[PDB]
Design a protein around this ligand. Sequence first.
Ligand SMILES: Nc1ncnc2c1ncn2[C@@H]1O[C@H](COP(=O)(O)OP(=O)(O)NP(=O)(O)O)[C@@H](O)[C@H]1O
Ligand SMILES: Nc1ncnc2c1ncn2[C@@H]1O[C@H](COP(=O)(O)OP(=O)(O)NP(=O)(O)O)[C@@H](O)[C@H]1O
Lengths: 451, 474
Amino acid sequence: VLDLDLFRVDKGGDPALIRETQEKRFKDPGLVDQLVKADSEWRRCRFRADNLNKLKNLCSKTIFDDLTADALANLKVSQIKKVRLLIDEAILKCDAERIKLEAERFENLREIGNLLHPSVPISNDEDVDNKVERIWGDCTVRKKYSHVDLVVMVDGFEGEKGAVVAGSRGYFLKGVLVFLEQALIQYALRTLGSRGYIPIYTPFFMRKEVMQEVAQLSQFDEELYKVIGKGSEKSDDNSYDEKYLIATSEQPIAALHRDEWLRPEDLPIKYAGLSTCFRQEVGSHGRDTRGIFRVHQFEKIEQFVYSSPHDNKSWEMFEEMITTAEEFYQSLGIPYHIVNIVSGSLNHAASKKLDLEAWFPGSGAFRELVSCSNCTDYQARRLRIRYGQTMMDKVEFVHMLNATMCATTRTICAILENYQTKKGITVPEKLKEFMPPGLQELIPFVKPAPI
Amino acid sequence: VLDLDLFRVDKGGDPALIRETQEKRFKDPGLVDQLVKADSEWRRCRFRADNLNKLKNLCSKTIGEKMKKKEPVGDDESVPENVLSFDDLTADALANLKVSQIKKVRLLIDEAILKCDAERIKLEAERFENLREIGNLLHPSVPISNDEDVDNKVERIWGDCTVRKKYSHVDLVVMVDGFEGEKGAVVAGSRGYFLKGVLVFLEQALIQYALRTLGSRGYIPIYTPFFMRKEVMQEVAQLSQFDEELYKVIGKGSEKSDDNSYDEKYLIATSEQPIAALHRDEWLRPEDLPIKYAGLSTCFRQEVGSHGRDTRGIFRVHQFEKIEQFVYSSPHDNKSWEMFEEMITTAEEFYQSLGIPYHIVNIVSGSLNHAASKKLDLEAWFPGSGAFRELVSCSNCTDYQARRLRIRYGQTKKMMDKVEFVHMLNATMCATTRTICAILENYQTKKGITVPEKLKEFMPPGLQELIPFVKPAP
RNA sequence: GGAUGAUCCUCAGUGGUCUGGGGUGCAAGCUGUCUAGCGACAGAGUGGUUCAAUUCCACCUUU
Ligand SMILES: Nc1ncnc2c1ncn2[C@@H]1O[C@H](COP(=O)(O)OP(=O)(O)NP(=O)(O)O)[C@@H](O)[C@H]1O
Ligand SMILES: Nc1ncnc2c1ncn2[C@@H]1O[C@H](COP(=O)(O)OP(=O)(O)NP(=O)(O)O)[C@@H](O)[C@H]1O
């Protein structure tokens, strides 16, 4: 949620930059001017409300014109009371007004995107105007057998029984791949565990009031599932509470330090989120439908950092994190290329996102496997997470960063497609440590490819 | 669900066994008097239906005879009378009526067929409603009482020694800096928790360990979905569970912007449930000897029963990982009851392997869930808390869930004799948080916690030997 | 029923826009509006009775 002073030309900022940054995001402006009107009205109405209460008190201080009052002392009892009761009608009306404006001003503010780093590409088309920054590994080789057939050929995936139980995209990951999953977990956990990231296991659902602070509408509409609880552990209570399953570990970790004052000294704080993530995936029908590349439920290990805003500690930590992931996917021997995402494809929170598109040889194309984002002070202001616990003056919030270390399932797929042979898939050297006796060497085929 | 025939007196079994089963379960036996009622009426509607069909054919037959006796005869308009009453008819009457009258009467029979169809459906539905909440048969060896603490019976004890220590799991989880209760209550509501740092590894160890243990003993590792469709969850859970355990999740039921419809799902409270639904509506082959599955899944409980119990730590939470041993077995040669006793020793050995003192218990009838025929509760000793807590449950549901999910013993050896369903059993290998609490109370020191030999292997470098305190106990 | 939430802390008092004693800081904290700035005004959990609520009452929250 951007600072309101950026809309006041009276105060520090200018909205013309906001508008421009909305256009760059390719979200229709106006929202900025709906904001500014609603705010300006709310100032006038908070000014009136003030002045009226100033008279409300002016009159008990004293104890036929009302538009504006002077140092009044003439008349009393009935003559003053009537005026004060008429003023009270005025405050009721200015109260209804204020509440309406406040609510609707913030309605507009809620869906205005964060500021953009200059380096971000300014276009709406992603295929065309996305820029690759770095390229690693062997990016042109191919192996023909896709991750679907591969996942089947190992006897690790039940897509039919998963469609029965959970209803399309639902799945039973079975046997050896479970150990393979676990490996990736353990490996990523140890990696980050060494680099000063503290591991953390999060809750999977939230209290809405909290979720609303960490998610934008779109996500509520086409991503977040909703949970319905009792909101009390008594049989007497037939009341209900709406909770929401998390789509990322970013969300629960972001809220971890809600409404706190974080000291500059302890401030560079790295969290290693461990969480299962539920997404409805309403955007994408008929996309990656067979395998487990794209599914409604999957474990994920995430890098979330709270950083100081002042210098460029945020954007150094950023470049560090992205490079962190790089070293992870370099170590498993996966070829990839880093891409800089266009302004249209950024979510409100982010100021800039660099994604790691890994090479899928069997499929013969580049699929996304890691995103990295710097939200700056956007989430922070909303979660009221400031910088230092109270000197004066001018309240400054932290900068918050979030990037995925490993998305267990899509990474598993990348492994399968890149390390296939004739017997099966070769286990990359890093994981051999954590793969059980028998798979340390390889992952053997036991089933044939479906036709 | 049970078998209807053992409700039917003219058929095999007796229903006074069932009413007795209820009395032992301390539930209502009047439920069965309702079952027997709706079944009786449903039979009546079956009988009439049949008799009615017979008549319909007899109308098409008498119609047959008309053309032979005369192409023209009598009157083609007149309406029928008295005959219509379908309780009692002949062929004489049908022979008397002209063609037209028999044709219309045939239509009235067809109307009455549809009326039966409807009413038959209503009875079937009501009988079922009665049947859902009727408990499985009890094994004699199960104790027969309602309260558990007084009338539970201990069968086995292992390990040392009803020993005591200090620092409950409540204080332990804090002292190691692995638990954030206050900020997790803010995020996820009451009882919610952030598990952090070292415990995360500890948990991951347990998982990794149990998974290799069972993965060695022939169990097939399996990762379940965490939510199930209404239909199927309804097949695997009972009403009280829906009221006081299963959270309700709501999806869109279609991945198109266009779609405004929603689909109601439910989050699982055990891996039992998605695994039971793995092989729904299937004929399990006799050759595939007891199929063993290692279920790895997080489990959501609303935990509505209990208010103000174990509120501080991670002992009772609304979300926790769990490893379950689930086997499909044969009902013949008491094979399930053997594997039952095997599976319990399996968990026994694991917890022996972790040096955790415990004792096996037979659970009383009055606390048993409908599905189970008999449940074994491995209760591990908490020195720091100073008591024994339920850590593991293993249950043999026999054919109950089986009958419900339509999972039969293959084609069976013979046909047209009686369809026999499989026996299915479910047991918890590891309850990560409760296990973690068990370990923290059993390996505690003053330096921190000692890592159990087996887990040392899976701990990351530096945490293989022990886990150090960093904070003081409140 | 008691305690509580936002006027430096603390005890006591009180319908007069708060008072007093003791302690602490500086030469009295937080939010918001107005003014170019100086600075002024409004807000004290929510409502009521009262012109007037720190008090009285209703009420809640956390405990
Ligand atoms: N349906 C899904 N199943 C599994 N992982 C997913 C899914 N959608 C997104 N992700 C994860 O999100 C990470 C990076 O993409 P992210 O930006 O988080 O979501 P996104 O941009 O919506 N990706 P997509 O929706 O697949 O184009 C990947 O490493 C994936 O693991
Ligand atoms: N509130 C809870 N939090 C975490 N795990 C639980 C909880 N309740 C039960 N379990 C797990 O499930 C098994 C306990 O017995 P089970 O029969 O599944 O549930 P239960 O008998 O209802 N136990 P409880 O609900 O604590 O009285 C153990 O493996 C537990 O760790």
